[PDB]
Amino acid sequence: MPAITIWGRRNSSNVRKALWCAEEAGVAYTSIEVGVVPTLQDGALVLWESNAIVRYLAAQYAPALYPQAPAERALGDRWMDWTTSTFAGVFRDLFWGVVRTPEAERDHARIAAALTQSGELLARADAALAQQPYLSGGRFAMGDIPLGSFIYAWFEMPIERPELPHLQAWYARLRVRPAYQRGVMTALT
């Protein structure tokens, strides 16, 4: 069995982050879904943090994805932290109310507020993607991966989205990557 194992449900955005990164690197890996947080194991290493798992997999296995100059890495680095620190919480809330709770249980005012704030948060990324074609800068790299794994849910969710055309063209370019198709575009349950 491959040295790399990734535990976790494939319909989680955090696990998508890791599967997509694994796929981008081409390495042998096992994905275990037991019957949400990814657990990475690679030899003696055990990782529980999505973005740490990403940064590791790219630096260790896909150096095309890990910019070596600190100043260029920092461009996409900030969107990795921002995805966790600012976007994921409100969006996971939006996504729960819409895909996973029964209408009898939906706090609509809250969903409505999640949807509205999700949108204006994303407007910030949309503005950055009007300056460069990737969160990582001129070329795709690890920095695009955390928000890229959420933005699949954003666009394929049954919701009314505000017009964010740079964000959308970026998602269109993500969709042409096979690693993104196999790693991220899973059952949106």
Residues at the contact surface with Cl ion, assessed by CB under 5 A: 13, 19, 35, 42-43, 95, 102, 133, 136-139, 153
> Among residues 113 and 133, whose Cβ is nearest to Cl ion?
133
Which residue type is seen at 76?
G
Rg (the chain; Cα; Å): 16
For strand 39-42 and strand 29-32, is the pairing parallel, antiparallel, or unpaired? unpaired
> Among residues 113 and 186, whose Cβ is nearest to Cl ion?
186
In whole angstroms, the minimum distance from the beta carbon of 173 to Cl ion comes to 11
In whole angstroms, the minimum distance from the beta carbon of 48 to Cl ion comes to 16
95 burial (CB, 10 Å; 0-12 / 13-18 / 19+) is buried
Q: Which residue minimizes CB distance to Cl ion?
A: 35
In whole angstroms, the minimum distance from the beta carbon of 132 to Cl ion comes to 6
**Residue 169 DSSP SS3:** helix
> Among residues 60 and 113, whose Cβ is nearest to Cl ion?
60
For strand 29-32 and strand 45-47, is the pairing parallel, antiparallel, or unpaired? unpaired
In whole angstroms, the minimum distance from the beta carbon of 97 to Cl ion comes to 9
